[PDB]
Design a protein around this nucleic acid. Structure first.
Ligand code: MG
Length: 209
DNA sequence: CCCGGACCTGTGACAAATTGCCCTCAGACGG
DNA sequence: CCGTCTGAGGGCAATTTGTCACAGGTCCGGG
């Protein structure tokens, strides 16, 4: 299946995208890299890739696309918009999109994963976690990395109530660890690092099945 | 000595959002 | 000209995600 690669600057960038938008984003990076910023999406190809109907595919593309407006990207800082013109459909079943050409150098010290690894993940924050572990993966398939909680919150743009740690644990950390273990070929564990009463980092270990 | 207070934890409620499903009907095309 | 495969719309209930009040732990310092 298509091998996604992206600059680490994108893996560690600050943004808030839905699952459907992130799914689309994988195809843009694939299209751009296999070469002005003008990309294209076919309804029927999207449906076959992610096992959706044509109808439900159409709904996902259309609503994802109009939700890009106003979204911004931060590289730690400098902020950019994803799109510089609205999307439009010249033909039935076909969409044309205009990615910000200033984003090109940030797309192409790199991260790589096959698209089948992430296509069953549902929670978008869990897609971001799996991308950040891959950045440190070894050829054989294992790795270990320590991520700071404040940096997790700023990079993944978690909602404000997750600055209370018990909600952070219950609705983000445990769920995203559980999905990865159930939906990817990776087997993931963790332990908490503390300083006084405050929890400051999360330490991730993983191997390949 | 014992307190309220400033921290921390986990859970039960409710509100807001998203999931895969379902149904209708016109466009594009080919045989 | 028409029958079929698409896909652009309109919805749903069942789950998940986002928010906050409340019980219950610790340690410190002033009364
Ligand atoms: Mg959908």
């Amino acid at each position: 299946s298509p091998r996604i690669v992206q600059s680490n600057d994108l893996t560690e960038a600050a943004y808030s995208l839905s699952r459907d938008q992130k799914r689309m984003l994988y195809l843009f990076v694939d299209q751009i890299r296999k070469s002005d910023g003008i990309c294209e999406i076919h309804v029927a190809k999207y449906a076959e890739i992610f096992g959706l109907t044509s109808a439900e595919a159409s709904k996902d593309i259309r609503q994802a696309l109009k939700s890009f407006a106003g979204k911004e990207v931060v590289f730690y800082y400098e902020s950019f918009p994803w799109f510089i013109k609205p999307a439009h459909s010249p033909s039935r079943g076909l969409y044309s999109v205009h990615i910000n050409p200033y984003l090109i150098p940030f797309f192409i010290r790199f991260t790589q994963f096959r698209l089948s690894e992430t296509k069953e993940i549902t929670n978008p924050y869990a897609m971001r976690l799996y991308e950040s572990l891959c950045q440190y993966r070894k050829p054989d398939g294992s790795g270990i990395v320590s991520l700071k909680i404040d940096w997790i919150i700023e990079r993944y743009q978690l909602p404000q109530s997750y600055q209370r740690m018990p909600d952070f644990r219950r609705r983000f950390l445990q769920v995203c660890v559980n999905e990865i273990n159930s939906r990817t070929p990776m087997r993931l564990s963790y332990i908490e690092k503390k300083k006084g009463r405050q929890t400051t980092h999360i330490v991730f270990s993983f191997r390949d099945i």
